């Protein structure tokens, strides 16, 4: 009886309010009834609205018998993220792939960069590991070559004068070693803003550091969601 439009509204509301168990139940029911278009429409609208809760919805489907729904109705990159596939993480603005540098500091940590050239070797391979906590999905961003996790400094102050350099470290148990994503649609692509769980700073590429055109990776100070052309990332298969 209830129209597909009204069910879309109910589903969107569930997701926005963080009632993921209702969202998953609804989604399974709609797909079983051949009304999967409801899910497609909600995913489209969530992304147009740049809702971070899209990630949670995807995750909860992924672990809640909804893997086929994820495959069918979300862009490919969502499955790459939830399935833990090897990926490249490429900055939209400069088209540079994320890597870690070759030297370690006394804390045994590497500095993160966008590579000026490389889009192919193991140097730019990553995978994501999910963590569900506080009714939210977070990501540990794991570097294949060096077996380290993307992070911000775990020794710096929790204050406005913090170190904003992005590093790689051996573990990912701290909120500073964890990240959350916000999707956005720009031109034909679904891209992601990637934010540090503890600091809320968006992952950004700053100034050029060498002749090959590498750029430093840093945490941005301020809102970025209006500018996916400047501050978002592509996630593509490695």
Tell me the C-alpha distance between 235 and 238, whole Å: 9
Q: How many domains does the chain have?
A: 2
Q: Give me the CATH number covering residue 189.
A: 2.80.10.50
Q: Which helix (H) or strand (E) holds 31?
A: helix 20-32
Q: Give me the CATH number covering residue 52.
A: 1.10.10.2400
Q: Indicate whether 151 and 189 sit together in one domain.
A: yes
Pair 111, 143: CB distance under 8 Å? no
Q: Indicate whether 82 and 146 sit together in one domain.
A: yes
Pair 39, 73: CB distance under 8 Å? yes
Q: Which residues contact 52 (CB under 8 A, 6 or more apart)?
A: 180, 181, 182, 183
Helix (H, G, I), strand (E, B) or coil at 201: coil
Tokens representing 1 are: 């009886």
Q: What is the largest CA-CA distance in the chain?
A: 65
Resolution in angstroms for this experimental structure? 1.8
Closest CA to 236 of 116, 73, 124: 124
Q: Indicate whether 225 and 150 sit together in one domain.
A: yes
Q: Which helix (H) or strand (E) holds 37?
A: helix 37-48
Alpha-helical (H) ranges within 84-227 are: none
Owning domain of residue 32? 1-75
Q: Indicate whether 38 and 122 sit together in one domain.
A: no
Q: Indicate whether 119 and 208 sit together in one domain.
A: yes
154-to-83, 132, 159, 177, 200 alpha-carbon distances in Å: 28, 21, 12, 8, 14
Dihedral sign computed on CA atoms, order 57, 62, 66, 72:
positive
Q: Indicate whether 91 and 177 sit together in one domain.
A: yes
The residue from 33, 51, 75 where one domain ends is 75
């Amino acid at each position: 009886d209830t129209s597909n439009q009204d069910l879309e509204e109910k589903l969107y509301n569930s997701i926005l309010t963080g009632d993921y168990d209702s969202a998953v139940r609804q989604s399974l029911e709609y797909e079983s009834q051949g009304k999967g278009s409801i899910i497609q429409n909600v995913v489209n609208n969530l992304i147009i609205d740049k809702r971070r809760n899209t990630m949670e919805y995807c995750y909860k489907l992924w672990v809640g018998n909804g893997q086929e729904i994820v495959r069918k109705y979300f862009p490919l990159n969502f499955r790459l993220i939830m399935a833990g596939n090897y990926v490249k993480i490429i900055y939209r603005n400069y088209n540079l792939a994320l890597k870690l540098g070759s030297t370690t500091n006394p804390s045994n940590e590497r500095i993160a960069y966008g590579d000026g050239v490389d889009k192919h070797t193991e140097l730019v391979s990553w995978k994501f590991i999910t963590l569900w906590e506080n009714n939210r999905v977070y990501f540990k961003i794991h570097n294949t070559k060096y077996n380290q996790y993307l992070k911000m400094s775990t020794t710096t102050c929790n204050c406005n004068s913090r170190d904003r350099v992005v590093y790689g470290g051996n573990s990912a148990d701290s909120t500073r070693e964890q990240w959350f994503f916000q999707p956005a649609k720009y031109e034909n692509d679904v891209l992601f803003f990637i934010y540090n769980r503890q600091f809320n700073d968006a992952l950004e590429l700053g100034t050029i550091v060498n002749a090959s055109g590498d750029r430093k990776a840093v945490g941005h100070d301020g809102e970025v969601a209006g500018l996916p052309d400047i501050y978002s990332w592509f996630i593509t298969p490695f």
